[PDB]
Curated annotation (Swiss-Prot):
Family per similarity comment: Belongs to the cation transport ATPase (P-type) (TC 3.A.3) family. Type IB subfamily.
Residue positions binding Cu(+) 2: 14, 17
Gene expressing this chain: ATP7A
Disease: Menkes disease: An X-linked recessive disorder of copper metabolism characterized by generalized copper deficiency. MNKD results in progressive neurodegeneration and connective-tissue disturbances: focal cerebral and cerebellar degeneration, early growth retardation, peculiar hair, hypopigmentation, cutis laxa, vascular complications and death in early childhood. The clinical features result from the dysfunction of several copper-dependent enzymes. A mild form of the disease has been described, in which cerebellar ataxia and moderate developmental delay predominate. Occipital horn syndrome: An X-linked recessive disorder of copper metabolism. Common features are unusual facial appearance, skeletal abnormalities, chronic diarrhea and genitourinary defects. The skeletal abnormalities include occipital horns, short, broad clavicles, deformed radii, ulnae and humeri, narrowing of the rib cage, undercalcified long bones with thin cortical walls and coxa valga.
Domain of life: Eukaryota
Protein's recorded name: Copper-transporting ATPase 1
Localization: Golgi apparatus, trans-Golgi network membrane; Cell membrane; Melanosome membrane; Early endosome membrane
Role played: ATP-driven copper (Cu(+)) ion pump that plays an important role in intracellular copper ion homeostasis. Within a catalytic cycle, acquires Cu(+) ion from donor protein on the cytoplasmic side of the membrane and delivers it to acceptor protein on the lumenal side. The transfer of Cu(+) ion across the membrane is coupled to ATP hydrolysis and is associated with a transient phosphorylation that shifts the pump conformation from inward-facing to outward-facing state.
Domain HMA: 3-69
Amino acid sequence: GEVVLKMKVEGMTCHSCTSTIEGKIGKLQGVQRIKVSLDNQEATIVYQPHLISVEEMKKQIEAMGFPAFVKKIEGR
């Protein structure tokens, strides 16, 4: 079963960079689900530390241009 992560998605500040990110990031190795809340300026992804390096997940978003950040991480 997967592990939850919560990420910060600062910089966008406009309700027009969710579904793109969600859908796109949906192809990333290790991701199982995504929910982006531009409202909250925050997002919740579910993945496992096998196909992704935990942080890489966020860094892919940083790579889009918008400086994001890591709030939560994998654990149990």
